[PDB]
Amino acid sequence: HHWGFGKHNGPEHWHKDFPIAKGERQSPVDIDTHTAKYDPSLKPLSVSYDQATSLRILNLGHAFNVEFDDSQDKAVLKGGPLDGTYRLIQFHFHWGSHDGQGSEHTVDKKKYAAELHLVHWNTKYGDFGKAVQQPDGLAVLGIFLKVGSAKPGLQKVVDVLDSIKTKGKSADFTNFDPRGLLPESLDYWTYPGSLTTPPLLECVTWIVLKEPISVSSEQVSKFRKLNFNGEGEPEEPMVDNWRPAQPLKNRQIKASFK
Ligand SMILES: [Cl-]
Ligand SMILES: [Zn+2]
């Protein structure tokens, strides 16, 4: 594909191939904590990953995915702002060229070192490819990463990155429990938005956790040793694969908490 994160094919350019890039419900956005409306009618999230079944980890070129077997009918996100049940299909991250940036969502303009996205599709549409064509097709759980103590549950992900350094490489990645990536609290903000990479489809109910996870400097630095390029090509370190905040327009961010 033409799009990427370079000066000439990066987010400022995506609209040429994907005109919805300038649409009405684009992601990510800045979350203004003063104006986000507390809604005490928002239910607790239900995150059930006990039966989530990881399969593989793959370098897609702009980031890496940890892919799950989404036939596992109890591996599910529901509750919160959602109707019905959503199946976990993959997770991935966005990160920066340094610790002071890398997140896609921002909180009062604050950028985190990275952001984790756990992607789920609405079972009422049969599969992921059908779900992305509907406004309520996906639910993405977003979790900020900040630098400090190490996150033990991330270690297996960061240690495997060496073996999938370049575009196209994959590795077995079974027995990975995504519960190890969740913070203590599930308090969240939610708003209707989009995929943050092309095709940028406006099919996503965003659920962004207020509480970041701490990861160590060494852990996040392993993200930056990945490469955009394929094997043999000239080294281009994979960094700054985040889309900046987009106009909120006529949307309301709600908060499940104070
Ligand atoms: Cl490490
Ligand atoms: Zn993402």
From Swiss-Prot:
Annotated catalysed reactions: hydrogencarbonate + H(+) = CO2 + H2O; urea = cyanamide + H2O
Residue ranges constituting the Alpha-carbonic anhydrase domain according to the UniProt record: 1-257
Cofactor(s) the record lists: Zn(2+); Co(2+)
Residues under site feature: Fine-tunes the proton-transfer properties of H-64: 5, 60, 65
Keyword Ribosomal protein (UniProt): no
Effect annotated for changing residue 92 to C/D/E/N/Q: Strongly reduced CO(2) hydrase and p-nitrophenyl acetate esterase activities, impaired stability of zinc binding
Mutagenesis / variant outcome for changing residue 196 to S/V: Reduced activity
EC numbers for this chain: 4.2.1.1, 4.2.1.69
Pfam families in UniProt: Carb_anhydrase (PF00194)
Mutation effect (residue 117 to E): Strongly reduced activity
Substitution effect: residue 195 to A: Reduced CO(2) hydrase activity
SMART domains: Carb_anhydrase
GO CC annotations, alphabetized: apical part of cell; cytoplasm; cytosol; extracellular exosome; myelin sheath; plasma membrane
Binding site for Zn(2+): 92, 94, 117
Active site: 62
Outcome (variant: residue 140 to H): Impaired activity
Site (Involved in the binding of some activators, including histamine and L-histidine): residue numbering on this chain: 90
Subcellular location: Cytoplasm; Cell membrane
Record-linked SUPFAM superfamilies: Carbonic anhydrase (SSF51069)
Function in brief: Catalyzes the reversible hydration of carbon dioxide. Can also hydrate cyanamide to urea. Stimulates the chloride-bicarbonate exchange activity of SLC26A6. Essential for bone resorption and osteoclast differentiation. Involved in the regulation of fluid secretion into the anterior chamber of the eye. Contributes to intracellular pH regulation in the duodenal upper villous epithelium during proton-coupled peptide absorption.
Additional observations: Target of drugs used in treatments against glaucoma disorder and breast cancer.
Subunit structure of this chain's protein: Interacts with SLC4A4. Interaction with SLC4A7 regulates SLC4A7 transporter activity. Interacts with SLC26A6 isoform 4 (via C-terminus cytoplasmic domain).
Protein's name in the database: Carbonic anhydrase 2
